[PDB]
Amino acid sequence: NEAAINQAIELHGFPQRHVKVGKEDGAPVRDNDLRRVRTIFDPRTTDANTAYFTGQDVDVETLEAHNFDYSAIHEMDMRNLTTALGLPLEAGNVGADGLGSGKPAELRFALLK
């Protein structure tokens, strides 16, 4: 699950630029034509305040970073692992509501001792 999150953050945690070229139902654009467009829009040589000027038939779309709750997957994984190893949840740098207080706290720390 940890490896799966790392790979998912790499692919989906960050937005990515999608430049679409040519008019819809218009003239086709070949790989050698896209190589030139790639040279203009290259994220390697782009900077924060670059501006773009185009004809109507160039679209700078974006793949948004697709939200997923990797924090909750981490909390679930850590809860599984700590409880399997008989440690309290707190040992894994993860916490839970209410369980830090009163008789709920007293029980789990009594069990540990």
Binding site: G22, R30, L34
Partner: protein, 140 residues
């Protein structure tokens, strides 16, 4: 044909003997039952030469590393030749009439584009992804 039309570029076509050209012209004429017999050999040569040139310039290269001419290159160049000869003949006839009767053909104008405008160009389009934009590239 001994040299085939897909083996021949524009510069090669110019270098062919009269017989090698007439052998390819003869092949293109097989794409009509009329063979366009009332058009000069030079109209047919110009249609073939410009089909060869248009293949090599407009329907060449790659899209997502796929070849842009997906179909058989021989019959693509022949249909593109036949298309041009039919446009030199004034276009695709929709209705014909005379002393000996009348006929009308299922045609319907097609779309607006060049190759859509004749039966030969409609055949040719299927060889070249129907002029669709399948190309894709990455950054590295």
């Amino acid at each position: 044909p001994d040299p085939s039309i897909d083996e021949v570029s524009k510069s090669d076509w110019d270098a062919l003997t009269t017989q090698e050209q007439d052998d390819i012209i003869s092949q293109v004429e097989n794409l009509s039952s009329t063979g366009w017999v009332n058009t000069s050999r030079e109209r047919k040569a110009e249609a073939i030469r410009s089909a060869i040139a248009e293949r090599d310039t407009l329907y060449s290269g790659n899209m997502s590393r796929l070849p842009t001419l997906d179909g058989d290159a021989e019959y693509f160049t022949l249909y593109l030749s036949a298309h041009k000869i039919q446009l030199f003949e004034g276009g695709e006839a929709q209705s014909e009439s005379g002393e000996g009767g009348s006929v009308s053909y299922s045609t319907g104008g097609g779309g607006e584009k060049d190759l859509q405008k004749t039966r030969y160009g409609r055949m040719a389009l299927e060889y070249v992804w129907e002029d669709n934009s399948i190309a894709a590239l990455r950054t590295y």
